[PDB]
Amino acid sequence: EPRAYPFNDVHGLTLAGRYGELQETEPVSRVRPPYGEEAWLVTRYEDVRAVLGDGRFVRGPSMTRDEPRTRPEMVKGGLLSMDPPEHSRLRRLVVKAFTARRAESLRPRAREIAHELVDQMAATGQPADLVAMFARQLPVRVICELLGVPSADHDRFTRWSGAFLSTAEVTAEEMQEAAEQAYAYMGDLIDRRRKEPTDDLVSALVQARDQQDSLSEQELLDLAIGLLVAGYESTTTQIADFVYLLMTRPELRRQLLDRPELIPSAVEELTRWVPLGVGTAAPRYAVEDVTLRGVTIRAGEPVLASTGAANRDQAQFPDADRIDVDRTPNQHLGFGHGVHHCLGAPLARVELQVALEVLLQRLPGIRLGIPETQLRWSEGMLLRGPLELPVVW
Numbered sequence: 461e462p463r464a465y466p467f468n469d470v471h472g473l474t475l476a477g478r479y480g481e482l483q484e485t486e487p488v489s490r491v492r493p494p495y496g497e498e499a500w501l502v503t504r505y506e507d508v509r510a511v512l513g514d515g516r517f518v519r520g521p522s523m524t525r526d527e528p529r530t531r532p533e534m535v536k537g538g539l540l541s542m543d544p545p546e547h548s549r550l551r552r553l554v555v556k557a558f559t560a561r562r563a564e565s566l567r568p569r570a571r572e573i574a575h576e577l578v579d580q581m582a583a584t585g586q587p588a589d590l591v592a593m594f595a596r597q598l599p600v601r602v603i604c605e606l607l608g609v610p611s612a613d614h615d616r617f618t619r620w621s622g623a624f625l626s627t628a629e630v631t632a633e634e635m636q637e638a639a640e641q642a643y644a645y646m647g648d649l650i651d652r653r654r655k656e657p658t659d660d661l662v663s664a665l666v667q668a669r670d671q672q673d674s675l676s677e678q679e680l681l682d683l684a685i686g687l688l689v690a691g692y693e694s695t696t697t698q699i700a701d702f703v704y705l706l707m708t709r710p711e712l713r714r715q716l717l718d719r720p721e722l723i724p725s726a727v728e729e730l731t732r733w734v735p736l737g738v739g740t741a742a743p744r745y746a747v748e749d750v751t752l753r754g755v756t757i758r759a760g761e762p763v764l765a766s767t768g769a770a771n772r773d774q775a776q777f778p779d780a781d782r783i784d785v786d787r788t789p790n791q792h793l794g795f796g797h798g799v800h801h802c803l804g805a806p807l808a809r810v811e812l813q814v815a816l817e818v819l820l821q822r823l824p825g826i827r828l829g830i831p832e833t834q835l836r837w838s839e840g841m842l843l844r845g846p847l848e849l850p851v852v853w
C-alpha cells in the first residue's frame with residue numbers, strides 16, 4: 461500500500477514516471493524507504509514549497525528518529541538538523557560573514573582554479589576523466605579559497621575531503637583518520653585567524669557578532685566543516701551532471717557556445733531540471749496534525765518533500781520536461797526553500813557558471829569518449845551522477 465521508494469533509477473538522471481502520476485492522482489502519498497520509517501511523499505511544487513516553508517514542519521526530531529533514507533548509516537547534525545530559534549541564531553552569524561558579495565569575490569579564483577584543472581587534463585591527453593580531474597577538484601579547492609586554507613595546504617585538504625564523498629571506497633578507519641585530520645587542521649586555522657585575522661571566511665566568522673552574540677569555538681569548527689561537506693559533493697555532482705548534459709545534448713552546447721552570456725540562466729534551468737537527489741529533501745516532521753490536499757499528516761509523522769519532482773511539476777513550469785536555457789520565470793526549489801534554503805547557493809551559482817564557462821572556452825568540442833550506454837553511474841544512493849566521465853576534445 462505504501463510504494464517502495466526511491467522511484468528514481470540511479471543509473472541516469474531520468475525523473476521517475478511515478479512522480480508525474482502521483483502529482484496527478486495522489487499528490488500526498490505513502491512510501492516505504494529501504495531504511496527508516498514509512499513516510500508521506502509530497503510531489504507538487506506548491507505543496508513541496510508549502511512544507512519546506514511552514515513553521516509546523518521541523519527538522520529537530522531528525523536527531524531522535526529513524527529517518528526514511530537510502531543507506532544503512534545515518535548522517536546527523538549540522539544546521540540542517542536544527543530548528544528556530546537555535547537554527548536562526550547560527551544562521552544569522554554565518555550569513556553575516558558568508559555574504560553574496562563574498563561569494564561573487566571568488567569568481568576570479570574559481571576561474572583560475574578551473575583553468576589549472578583543465579591544464580592538468582590537457583597535460584595527460586585524451587581521454588581524461590572529467591569527474592576525477594575536474595568535478596571532484598573544483599569545489600573543494602574553491603571551499604579552500606573561501607575558508608582561507610593556505611595554497612600550500614590545498615592538496616592535503618583536498619585529499620582528506622575526498623574521503624567524505626558518498627562515492628569514496630575507503631574503509632571506516634581510513635575515513636575516520638581523514639576526518640580527524642580535517643577537524644584538527646580546521647580548529648588550528650580558526651585559532652590562527654582569531655589572533656591574526658585576514659580577509660577569508662574563517663576570519664569573518666570569528667569576528668561575526670549579532671547583538672553581542674558570537675560563535676563559540678566548537679560552533680566555528682562545526683560550521684566550517686559543515687560548509688565543506690554541504691558544499692563539496694553537491695557541487696561536484698552537479699558539475700558532472702551539467703557537463704554530461706552539455707556533451708549529450710548538442711543544442712544545449714551550441715546555445716552556450718554561441719552566447720556564453722546565457723550561462724547564468726542555463727545554470728538555473730539545469731538546476732531546476734536535473735533531479736539531482738536519489739530521493740527527497742531531508743525528512744520534515746509534523747509538530748501537529750496538518751491537512752494537505754485533504755490528507756491529514758498526524759503530529760510526529762515524517763514528510764519527504766521532493767524538490768526533484770516539484771521542479772518538474774507541469775503546473776508550475778510550462779512544458780516542464782523541456783530544458784529551456786532562457787526559461788523565465790524560473791522560481792525553482794533546486795536550492796531548497798524556507799529557513800534551510802541553501803546557505804551556499806550564491807557561491808554554488810558562481811562555481812557552476814565558472815565550470816561551464818571555462819570548459820566551454822577551453823574545450824569547445826568536449827564530448828564523451830565512450831558511448832553513453834557504457835557510462836558508470838554512482839551507486840552511493842544519495843545523489844545521482846556518473847562515476848567517471850571520460851572525455852575527448
Ligand SMILES: CC[C@H]1OC(=O)/C=C/[C@H](C)[C@@H](O[C@@H]2O[C@H](C)C[C@H](N(C)C)[C@H]2O)[C@@H](C)C[C@@H](C)C(=O)/C=C/C=C/[C@@H]1CO[C@@H]1O[C@H](C)[C@@H](O)[C@@H](OC)[C@H]1OC
Nearest residue numbers: 533535537538539540624626630631632686689690693842
Ligand atoms: C551527499 C551529501 C552528504 O554526503 C553524505 O551524507 C555522506 C555519507 C557518507 C557515505 C558516510 O560515509 C560512510 O559511513 C559508513 C559508516 C561507512 C561507509 N563505508 C566505509 C563503507 C562510508 O562511505 C558518512 C558517515 C561520512 C562522514 C565523513 C560524514 O559525516 C559525511 C558528511 C557529508 C554529508 C554530505 C552533505 O550533506 C550535508 O549533511 C549534513 C549532515 C547537513 O547538516 C547539511 O550540511 C550542513 C547537508 O547538506 C545540505
Ligand code: HEM
Nearest residue numbers: 539540690691694695698741742795796800802803804808
Ligand atoms: C550545486 C550545489 C548545491 C546544491 C544543488 C545545493 C542544494 C541545497 C539544498 C536543496 C539545501 C536544502 C536542503 C533541505 O532543505 O533539506 C541546501 C542546504 C545547505 N547548503 Fe547547499 N547546495 C549546493 C551547494 C552548497 C555550497 C557550495 C554550500 C556552502 C559553501 C552549501 C551549503 C549549505 C548549507 C550550510 C545548508 C543547510 C542550510 C540550513 O539548514 O540552514 N551548499 N543546499
